[model samples]
Every structure is written in C-alpha cells, then in structure tokens.
Target: AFIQLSKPCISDKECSIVKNYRARCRKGYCVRRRIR
Candidate 1:
C-alpha cells in the first residue's frame, strides 16, 4: 500500500489527471506532500 501510494506518474498527462485531488506530481511521483 505504501509503495503504491508514491508511484510516479508516467507522464505529464498522468499528473494533470490528478490535479487538486489530494495528490500531485512531485519530482514525478503523484504523492501527497502538501496540506493546502
């Protein structure tokens, strides 16, 4: 579960897919690292 939670997005398209959804592209992985 932990590994899956920090899986890197394959591309910019993937990043855009989860925008403002409690997840975002950081370096590459779509992980939750922000509080706002």
Candidate 2:
C-alpha cells in the first residue's frame, strides 16, 4: 500500500537519486549503497 506523491529536485551532491520514473523521486545523496 504505497501512497503520497512528490517531485524530484537534484539540488546538489547532497541530493540523492530520484525516481522520476525508473529512479527520479528520491532524496539524500547515496544513502546506503546507491552511491556514484
């Protein structure tokens, strides 16, 4: 049961990978292992 909606904003290196579709609606740069 997933709810809530938001937009993507890649502010800076602090901003994480968003899931606009495949991955644009996200926050926080590289949390656990999704680092670049």
Candidate 3:
C-alpha cells in the first residue's frame, strides 16, 4: 500500500492510481473493488 487519496474524491479515478485496483465512486467516496 502507498499514500493515496489524502482527501475525499469526487470520482474513482482520483481514488486509485493502480489499474487493477480500480474502485467505484459512491456517496462521494471510493469503495474498494473487493480484493484482498
């Protein structure tokens, strides 16, 4: 894990920088892609 999303994001793109770790924006927050 690395430093990311110091502040809340409006979109998922700002949440995850990694391609495989893509997430979704919900309620103005990025939810994990359900990966361990």
Candidate 4:
C-alpha cells in the first residue's frame, strides 16, 4: 500500500489510518516515519 507516505493530510489521524509506516500529518501532508 501507499501508506500515506506522500499523501496530503490535515491531521495525524488522517495519516494514521494508512498505518503502514507510522505516518503523521505535517504542514499539510502525510509524513512517513521510521518504524520500530
């Protein structure tokens, strides 16, 4: 899945739904954070 890594978002929840790689919304887009 794309996992919201390079997607647009307004809130952290928006990115979390993707749940592929600890995504969080920053500035207005989804950011892919490293997984532990």
Candidate 3: regions farther than 4 A off: 1-7, 12-21
- Across 1-36, the per-residue lDDT of candidate 1 in tens digits comes to 455644556555565536534455667766656655
Indicate the residue-level lDDT of 18 in model 4: 67
Superior by TM-score: candidate 3 or candidate 4? 4
In model 1, state the lDDT of residue 9: 67
State the lDDT of candidate 2 residue by residue for 1-36, as single tens digits: 778775455543434334332222245332233436
**Candidate 3, lDDT over the whole model:** 0.66
Off by over 4 Å in 2: 11-36
Give the better candidate number (2 or 3) by TM-score: 3
For model 4, name the residue pairs that clash: none
Best model number under TM-score: 4
Ranking by TM-score: 4, 3, 1, 2
Compose the digit string of candidate 4's lDDT tens values, residues 1-36: 656655557677556656554576777776677765
What is the C-alpha lDDT profile of model 3 across 1-36, one tens digit per residue? 997867665666656666555677776766666755
What TM-score does model 3 achieve against the real structure?
0.29
* TM-score, cand. 4: 0.33
Per-model TM against the reference: 0.26, 0.17, 0.29, 0.33
